[PDB]
């Protein structure tokens, strides 16, 4: 494909990238993304706990989470020396470390190989900024219309790593 | 090798046996990666 142009937008506290794809490839990606999400939903790929979900705005999510903690079994009992632990973190670099070919295999597990090769190959482009260039062959380009599906996928994979298939 | 790797499953174990059986060094990248003194 062609090459995308990058530039940073500034929140005074940490810059954040902002890309730009060509128009034709924009349209194609937009379509592919609606499609992928529509199916993936219909076939229940993303299990429930992958949770910027469609049904609830974030604050309702907070309420849901609280009262979930509440309805556990004997959660507040501390008699026999139990202890509860709530831990929360980031993944600290997921985008920049998605590895292209292995991602290609992990997509071939989900979609057909033509869609899969489309996605993987599109993530490999030349990144422009007024004079500098390079070919983005390690990370993933958050800015393409279907970066969301890929990220939520790679998430679920590492989720299975943290939980373990049993749980 | 399979240190760091608790709980080798059957097909991973198999794939690893077969790879360490079958793979010896390639040439194209070995060339890809002399200076007249």
């Amino acid at each position: 494909f062609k090459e995308v142009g990058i530039e940073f937008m500034d929140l005074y506290s940490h810059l954040v990238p902002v890309y730009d794809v060509e128009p034709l490839e924009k349209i194609t990606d937009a379509y592919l993304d609606q499609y992928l999400w529509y199916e993936a939903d219909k076939r229940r790929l993303f299990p429930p706990w992958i949770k910027p979900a469609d049904t609830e705005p974030p604050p309702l999510l907070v309420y849901k989470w609280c009262q979930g903690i509440n309805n556990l079994q004997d959660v507040w009992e501390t008699s026999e020396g139990e202890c509860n632990v709530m831990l929360e973190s980031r993944f600290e670099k997921m985008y920049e470390k998605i590895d292209l070919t292995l991602l290609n295999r992990l997509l071939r597990l989900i979609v057909d190989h033509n869609i899969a090769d489309y996605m993987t190959a599109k993530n490999n482009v030349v990144i422009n900024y007024k004079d500098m260039n390079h070919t983005n062959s390690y990370g993933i380009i958050r800015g393409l219309q279907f970066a969301s599906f890929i990220v939520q996928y790679y998430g679920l994979v590492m989720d299975l790593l943290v939980l373990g298939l049993h749980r | 090798p399979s240190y760091y790797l608790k709980n080798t499953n059957a097909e991973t174990r198999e794939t690893l046996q077969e790879l360490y059986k079958e793979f010896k060094g390639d040439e194209i990248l070995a060339a890809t990666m002399e200076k007249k003194k």
Partner: protein
């Protein structure tokens, strides 16, 4: 439990990596710069 997880402890021998105690006289690769980039880009 725990019978099925995939990676036993990977932090066995990572003894703090004393690069953060090196000093490198080269701007674009000093530890100060690396950490400052880590902070200010997303």
């Amino acid at each position: 439990w725990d019978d099925d997880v995939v990676f036993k402890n990977c932090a066995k021998g990572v003894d703090d990596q004393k690069k953060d105690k090196r000093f490198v006289n080269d701007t674009l690769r000093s530890e100060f710069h690396k950490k400052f980039m880590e902070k200010y880009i997303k």
